[PDB]
Amino acid sequence: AAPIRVGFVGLNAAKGWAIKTHYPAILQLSSQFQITALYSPKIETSIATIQRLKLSNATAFPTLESFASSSTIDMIVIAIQVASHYEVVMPLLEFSKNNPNLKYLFVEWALACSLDQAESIYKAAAERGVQTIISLQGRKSPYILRAKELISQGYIGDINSIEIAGNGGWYGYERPVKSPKYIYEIGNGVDLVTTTFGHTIDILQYMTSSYFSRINAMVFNNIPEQELIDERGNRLGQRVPKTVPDHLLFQGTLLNGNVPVSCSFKGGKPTKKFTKNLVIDIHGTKGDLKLEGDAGFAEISNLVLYYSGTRALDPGYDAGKEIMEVYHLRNYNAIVGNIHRLYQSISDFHFNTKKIPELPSQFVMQGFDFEGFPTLMDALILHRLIESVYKSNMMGSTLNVSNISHYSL
Amino acid sequence: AAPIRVGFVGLNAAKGWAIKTHYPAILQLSSQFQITALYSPKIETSIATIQRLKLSNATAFPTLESFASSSTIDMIVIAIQVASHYEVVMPLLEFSKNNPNLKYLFVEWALACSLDQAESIYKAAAERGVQTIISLQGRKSPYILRAKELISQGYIGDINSIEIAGNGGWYGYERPVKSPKYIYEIGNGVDLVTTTFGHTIDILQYMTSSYFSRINAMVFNNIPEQELIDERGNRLGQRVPKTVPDHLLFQGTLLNGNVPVSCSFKGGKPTKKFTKNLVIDIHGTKGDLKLEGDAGFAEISNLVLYYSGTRAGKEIMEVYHLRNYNAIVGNIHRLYQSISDFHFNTKKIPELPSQFVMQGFDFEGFPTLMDALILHRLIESVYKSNMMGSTLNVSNISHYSL
Amino acid sequence: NTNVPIFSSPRSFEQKHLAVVDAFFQTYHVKPDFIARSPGRVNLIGEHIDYCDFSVLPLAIDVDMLCAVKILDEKNPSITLTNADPKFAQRKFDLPLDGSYMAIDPSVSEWSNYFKCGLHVAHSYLKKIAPERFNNTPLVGAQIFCQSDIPTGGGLSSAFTCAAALATIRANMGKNFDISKKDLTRITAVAEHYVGVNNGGMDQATSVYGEEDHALYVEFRPKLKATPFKFPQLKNHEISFVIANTLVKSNKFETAPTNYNLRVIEVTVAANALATRYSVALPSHKDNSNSERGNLRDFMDAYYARYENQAQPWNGDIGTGIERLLKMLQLVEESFSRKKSGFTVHEASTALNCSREEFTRDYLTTFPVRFQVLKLYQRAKHVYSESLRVLKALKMMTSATFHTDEDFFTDFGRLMNESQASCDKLYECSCIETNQICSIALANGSFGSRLTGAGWGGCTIHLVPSGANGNVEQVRKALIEKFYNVRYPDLTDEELKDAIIVSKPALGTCLYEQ
Amino acid sequence: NTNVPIFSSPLPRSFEQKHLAVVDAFFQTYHVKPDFIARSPGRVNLIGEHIDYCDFSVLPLAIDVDMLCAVKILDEKNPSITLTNADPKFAQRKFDLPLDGSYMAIDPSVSEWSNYFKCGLHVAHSYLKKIAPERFNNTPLVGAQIFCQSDIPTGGGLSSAFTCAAALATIRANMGKNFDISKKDLTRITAVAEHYVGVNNGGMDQATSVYGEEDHALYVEFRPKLKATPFKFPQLKNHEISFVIANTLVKSNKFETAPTNYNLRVIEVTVAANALATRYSVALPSHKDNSNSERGNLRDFMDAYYARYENQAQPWNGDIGTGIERLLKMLQLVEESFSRKKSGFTVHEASTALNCSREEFTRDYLTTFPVRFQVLKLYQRAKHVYSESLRVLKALKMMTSATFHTDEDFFTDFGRLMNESQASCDKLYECSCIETNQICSIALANGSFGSRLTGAGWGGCTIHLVPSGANGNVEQVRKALIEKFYNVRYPDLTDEELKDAIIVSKPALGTCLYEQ
Ligand SMILES: Nc1ncnc2c1ncn2[C@@H]1O[C@H](COP(=O)(O)OP(=O)(O)OP(=O)(O)O)[C@@H](O)[C@H]1O
Ligand SMILES: Nc1ncnc2c1ncn2[C@@H]1O[C@H](COP(=O)(O)OP(=O)(O)OP(=O)(O)O)[C@@H](O)[C@H]1O
């Protein structure tokens, strides 16, 4: 009955993603979660944030050790820049042994800047013995859940083939003069492939309940320099370097059914004139399913889902007629909503709301289950897939990735 | 001048492609072309065809040798099954040395069943020293020519990226009981990759004026057995083997601008429910061009072309669709016209040479056997890429260093 | 009459008042500042026509939603929601310090969404009347206890949204801010749309305008209007309507894509297929998601303005209305009678003279929907014929005299039976339980029996003579023995008592000050 | 007369002269005498440019230049048509007729002179199939040797005269010497003939070519039915009414420019009609037989607006006064609707004005004929159409006026209507050109009372209202044009070319056949 006490590294009232997503999600669940702790390298920032958001149950901690050691925390949320995850999480995990109450470690995607760091973080987290969560909140999108339902229940029959087209938003020819350099530089754990393809391709695996068998990728830097623009979109006459990718070609096969998947991710603008900028098109033996989005990345955007097919809540249908479904939620705020539904699932698990008679204390991964939430193991498997995308590009070869979902040590 | 006298191998009044396409084209150009010769293994087939089509200037030849040696032929057209191209064209070319009048050899795509046979045919045709033509008639589609104009004249700026989606028609889960087995068995020079992807990817190269730098392909036989269906679409309770592919994934880069290209070719039915079955989407720095087709392979389909971009400094919108255009007859007809324009030098060019090696990316003229060979080398590399599990560098395949 | 009535201290209403005050105290350990009350409703006739803008014939009943409220003006402002029925788990949410609107997740069935949507429309209303006080600062927090004895099918969802909005306005404007009935009804009209149900304005209007011992004539066009009326005084008989609960499992939200929301879509498509066939244009409603592309009354008006001496829109006159609706039923026959099997998406597109893609964009993208066919014939026929039956019911109810008491019970009863037949065979929103209840009722003292509310479960109503010289007890006994005892053997004395209720028209929305 | 007239000899001398010369050229070409000659005249439109495809009435006349198709019918085992042109820049064509009677394909993607013959042959073929199925269904048409000779200048409706002559020749060659060809059927089947060649034109030119007669202009109406009423120019006291035609000599390329010029105009007025209909909540009919306006036109809007909001008004049954009031109403609605968007509508704004998506707008208005644009000028195009139609009605009144005016009043008033029409074509419809504008100005300063382009524009021809007779201005105008335009822009024109650049025609006989 006691709220889950949350400690944040990276909640800042004046900027960042956590203030836009985690924070509003928590307000909606204020009997289930309470913010009790903040840590930032500058104490002033934590103090300013606690003031502005009136976080009356929160304490600003002066050091990582004091924060991580504190027994006032049940769940730690890491929402700082990915380039800082490893250097923060590793010592934190060790200090957190001083806290016998710690039950959850919740990290933003991407987990780390390289597979090696992801592997080390995962190992340390498993060693700590806490339930882990990764923010792959596309798995909690109502659109993704509905699609997963249709597929799993047999509405498209077997999957024949899949096409995916996405857009990375920032990696086109121009860059706003106010955009921060860090998302455009290699090694910072944020880029078209790791971040945007990351969310989208994991969404695909989740919806179809299959990992990949074989993959081939080509990664491009055809735009080594972007043109600075003002807010009105006018070029200011100055170029700046972009070392991260501006295009991704990916193709491969789903393990279940050897299903062909073709993907192209455009870096940014110009947007497409005659085609939606986000499309997931799934062709089955018995029906088709298509998800399209006008605005934004799959994991934070309001989509439309189209379905038509047959399997030839109980509805009385005619055997020789296609069923049509359209699924769109007009007033759905996906930026707040998908994260909110992720918190809801953490809450449901913690308080055992469904009252499932034998729900274990912890689970290693969500995998393709509807229930629960994605963990650091689901994150690690995604990192292994991203690594193979980069390796495939580097070696000029189609890679067998059929075993990346298996862990040994 | 006198009409180009055409000899056909494979013109059958009762069936096949030539009767649906080449024949009606010649009727429309009856002053530029005349059919003077037919050859078929069964002379009765030629005689019947000559009778039924009232081919008053044509003779049915008893043997390949007598056909190929005949001085009454200026242009030989080969429109038989691809599986027979090599066994016919090789001795034909040699016999054809007895005909001092031979100026053109016209072959349907695909040229051959393997790259090796393609190379041998090309070498034989080059040595014979006649002008060659391949039927990549997508290059004479008004839709393709208009797109090529827009691109080449700068209307989309530099090309950022390209997506292609196509359908092979026959290679889904069901097969009509009346459908001929040969198009479903490997080694017959007819399949999703060789034929349908071939036409479409050559079209792309032509429209963008670029060959490929690097490619990777995955080739699928997820449907090793198809269900026979009656003409009404009902399954008859019997499967038959399919050894040719039912899917193609292809990705790579155009040499010109290192342009990303993503392709997916679906084998057949079911067709897509929410997307056109043929799409070529070209994204540029200054505009986009998209070609869509609801019916038919690109090289025989009436398409719609969409353009939007800038070249005042405001956005231009163009839609290009010809409602009454018959592309099945039309594209072939436009190919015949280009052969005729070349032959009679109709555009009055004072120093137009007698022969050329290849069209390449040129607007003028027509695709040759060299253009066909280069496409064969690309197709071979697609299959090799799949077999090796490798991204191949094919930047030099357009070089005939021999 | 203009404003929502306010009270301080119907022997039944006092008992509940004290009962909820103590439940609130037991939950929150303090006494509440006020109680917002909003009653359930039944519709005598006129089902599934309100979202087509046709007038209806409802009344408020003696069951209500009670929201007891303690105001808490101490940031961090938060709202705690407790339900007397423990199956609706307690919620708590902090108000945005912005004070931006709170998000609502319309993808799930959630009891607090109804409170949240009433809160939202109130919030928006407040920012319009008092921009300086409400634009950049949150609402007051609150502890709230919700208790309802409205059976499912009794317009509980709308009573809840009305009570929620009422509470939000009262808590933020203060004790003596008069709250308009007209405004309360206007702002709540679209409230449930935010939670995934594309309903009409009948239930909100009824809850707000209800009056003790009066039924209501509720109109939506040309203006929202609710006229109270008493049942006719008969020679020696009491007119009454008994409500019987089907006890069917409540899931309107889960089935909306194939049931409630599909119907609304079907009637919009029908209106537009008619307009296309007769070469008239319909208005484009931008105020309401019911029918952004025009509805069946818009078609009636458009048809008449084009073909009947450029006639002005129907103003609600009974005689005129019967005439025009009879014409409409003719056009439905000519237009759709040859397509009783229904229209596939391709056929509906053709009928509207547009592509499948454009049809999908214009009609299928507003609320989730799932179907094989759209039954334009049956759905339009229902709406036009049902609207016709309301007009007939109204003229009866407003007649000062009738030949005999029997005549009234038989004629009015017949209209109800026709309405039921139509809801069942044409609109297909009845159910086995409904059908069983009605037939039994009719065979045992009822003159007319029909579902009320959305259907697919819910409640049923029955016209029965009440009082020492009536059939009330004959009907009740027959239902208990032949229906409830059979299908639901385990019902407890109280449940059984609750499954059947006799109500007089009740007072509308009101506040109790503490 | 009901049927196309047939002659074997002479009609003014001019006909037999041109007739003998084309017989000579045919003979020199084919080494045999032809069996018959299909003739169809060019035309000028006095007033009413670019409104025929909007279904508004026009005021044209056939002129004494024409298309002559001399034909020899062939008895062939392989039936074929050979087409030779008097002008060697139109190279000879020959094609075999499908032996099973099927239709020949037409490639609408290229400009080709024989496409006009082919589309005329196509509509005639389809007509032959309808009236004699059991004999044209599965058997080929008859072969022929054909020689084509036109002295119609570009802009004189040559393309339509040609299509009309081709269709006529095709019916005559296949039905024989004793088959009556009705003017009604001929005008009907050729109405949509050019649509097969890529040009989305109206019915003015075909109707004029067919319904022309000696010394009569025509009032041509399209709704509710095609109607052509001949009338003579008013008898003036001591001046004769003449229209001098002057060719701009601008390079002909209507087909190549159609996506930005002629076909775009047609799209703009359909879009304008539907934006008006949307704004005023009325539905337009769904034309199923003609590609001009499958979604309705500006006359459809006028009718639909009156049916909905003006039920009490008296009907318009070709009454001029009433017609004028309805058009003045339309002009008001155009101001209220589009006057704040004189910069034009982008594809997105047009879609919004029609209350649909860009995709549906594109499918519904932009995929019928190739088109290319930055904006659609709904205001200017609709303003032109309604005002131009109003000018036709006032012109008609003058031509058939009972109330009498001085000779000078006629010339000044009728000229003013022509001048207002030119200003509207130039500034509102944007279908004039520099050469047109220069010719019209020189003409007006040198004896013309009214000068405007005729035909589609973007080049082509112009017409000039001049007094002829004892003291007319015909020669005054000619010399000023030669000196001030032709010598200046085309210094190297032969005397022959100059003679042909400026002509004076009387109304001429419509379509006809010469036997032998
Ligand atoms: N006692 C309650 N308190 C608060 N919310 C409730 C209560 N009972 C039901 N609800 C909510 O109302 C929902 C039912 O809405 P619904 O509109 O179908 O009922 P109704 O208003 O009674 O029916 P109808 O509109 O047909 O009259 C339930 O799913 C639940 O979320
Ligand atoms: N002497 C000719 N004989 C046959 N065809 C001709 C001849 N001259 C021109 N043409 C054809 O007619 C086409 C011109 O069509 P166009 O409609 O623009 O002329 P027009 O009928 O005179 O003009 P307009 O419709 O504006 O009055 C040319 O492109 C060419 O194909």
Ligand SMILES: OC[C@H]1O[C@H](O)[C@H](O)[C@@H](O)[C@H]1O
């Ligand atoms: O008559 C049906 C009735 O049912 C629903 O529940 C709605 O709340 C009402 O608006 C009304 O549509």
Ligand SMILES: OC[C@H]1O[C@H](O)[C@H](O)[C@@H](O)[C@H]1O
């Ligand atoms: O008035 C313009 C005129 O010009 C064109 O060329 C057409 O052939 C005619 O139908 C007519 O539109």
Ligand SMILES: [Mg+2]
């Ligand atoms: Mg309700």
Ligand SMILES: [Mg+2]
């Ligand atoms: Mg013309």
